[PDB]
Amino acid sequence: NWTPEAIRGLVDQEKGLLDPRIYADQSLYELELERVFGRSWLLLGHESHVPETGDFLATYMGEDPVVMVRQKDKSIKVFLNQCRHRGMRICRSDAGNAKAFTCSYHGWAYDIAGKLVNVPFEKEAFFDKAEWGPLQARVATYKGLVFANWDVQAPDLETYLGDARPYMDVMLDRTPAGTVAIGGMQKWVIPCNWKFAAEQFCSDMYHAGTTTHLSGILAGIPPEMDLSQAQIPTKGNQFRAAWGGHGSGWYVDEPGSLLAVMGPKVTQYWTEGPAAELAEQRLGHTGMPVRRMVGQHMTIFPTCSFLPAMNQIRVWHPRGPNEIEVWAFTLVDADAPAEIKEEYRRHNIRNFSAGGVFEQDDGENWVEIQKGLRGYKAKSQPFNAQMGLGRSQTGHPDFPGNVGYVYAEEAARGMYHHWMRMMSEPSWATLKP
Template sequence: ITDEDLYQLELERVFARSWLLLGHETQIRKPGDYITTYMGEDPVVVVRQKDASIAVFLNQCRHRGMRICRADAGNAKAFTCSYHGWAYDTAGNLVNVPYEAESFACLNKKEWSPLKARVETYKGLIFANWDENAVDLDTYLGEAKFYMDHMLDRTEAGTEAIPGVQKWVIPCNWKFAAEQFCSDMYHAGTTSHLSGILAGLPEDLEMADLAPPTVGKQYRASWGGHGSGFYVGDPNLMLAIMGPKVTSYLTEE
């Protein structure tokens, strides 16, 4: 899974054609508020517009390919490339070119904006997609919304992202990091994933009221000295973790 040719194919087939989570709307509350992040290996700017919509565009100047914005987050009326001063508005449109008449007399600025992505949101989460032919976000998320609804907008105040920027550099293939959150529930009931379990439980239940999932059917696959599996036990706990359809399938006689 770490083959370089396969990785390049994943960038083209997966990251370039999927809806990718970029942030939360509370990170960019006011017009001009922005964050910078990545879609695959492509740097992008995510910025709130004057009409409250959100724009996502490639963070790369069309002149010499330099970064348009080098900060992690902030507020801006425009973005100016530090190399030759080409300026873009918050929607990513090229609006000013120094010495345009002398150096680029035939330049049509409307044709020289950075590549712009499709943008849609779900309960405050900001998603973007390079593929103009991809299905809409609601269709793409499908039944995964069951799990997202456990965690998002659980009160009238809604969900709010914690301010600030934190970054980790992990020397691994992207799938290794993803598998840490989907391969097993060994530590889910006590440590890092506990909040996710509790969010999916009925409000009148506590973890102490649930039977540990150690009996019933077992589906297990082992690799690299570690295993993962589904242990069928308390239906309430299973419902929180696996959703209604999977729970019904695994518990049917």
């Protein structure tokens, strides 16, 4: 039995130490589904995935299957994809349009709201249908992105995010028209813990600026150029949220990072022109130089990770301590030209799909770590998270919040600290922002 005392000792943000058991222990994972995933805001997709009435999307909240469906009154409703009679899946396809939902086991019928409307042979065999509908979740939308939470005790989405909102708006609020999701959702399986993937997009630029993506950059630079010239970025910053365990990292004034991954046509759209002029004008309350921010990574705790400068968005669905499913999609501006939309589509496939020149090396690292953690001695000594320890300060003229150096693990320590808090503190009164 994991006592609150034992859980607090797994993460030490003061010394910068992480107990490797957190990625491997079966008992800890069981608690994660309750303490972390059961009461966090989890990403399900975009409003454009379910644009019209009756449109649905079958996705996951932890290991719980859920149905995200647009209603008649233009609202989005999320309910558990489980019939309360004997546990059968109500919505058995990936996506589409439904006038109603019906269970294939015993014929219990449901409306698009997720309410039990008809029970076969109810009068002869039977109890109120209003009470026996599938478990509903709280639905909140942040400028396109749809989030869900089971817990009524949990704070609202706006307060949950905190000062991480400005960095989300770099991707989500460049035009008054908003964003739209490109069709299709990539799905693949990685045998590793979700925290390895969540931490990397939270704080780990360190892997991209060193060895992991040497061949990834090589793939994107012109045939006439090799890694010897490839401009190496060193200047940048890292953001840690005041509350939540949210983190972000970006390069400052270095085109070679975005040029190799996204190409010249995307960079032209992102940094120059009236499109980039409107982006800096709309994001004036922050005081950020968004035209100078290139190659950004961000994680909204626990499992919402994205890359603003390349619009790569993904959810990590947990599948035990030793496995995850990656569900990835891409965003473009609603009023973005057909030329720029195709450039974002092609380059995100080339880089961040299962066969993507960057994604291949990302998974390879995580797969090998998880294997090693099967051993006793490999879990007996803590991991090092001492990078940028006590070097971040809240007084920065351009980037708001707790900001340090790009190659640091302050946001990483912030993520594991918030993980530890959620796992050890049962009440939201102590846990609130």
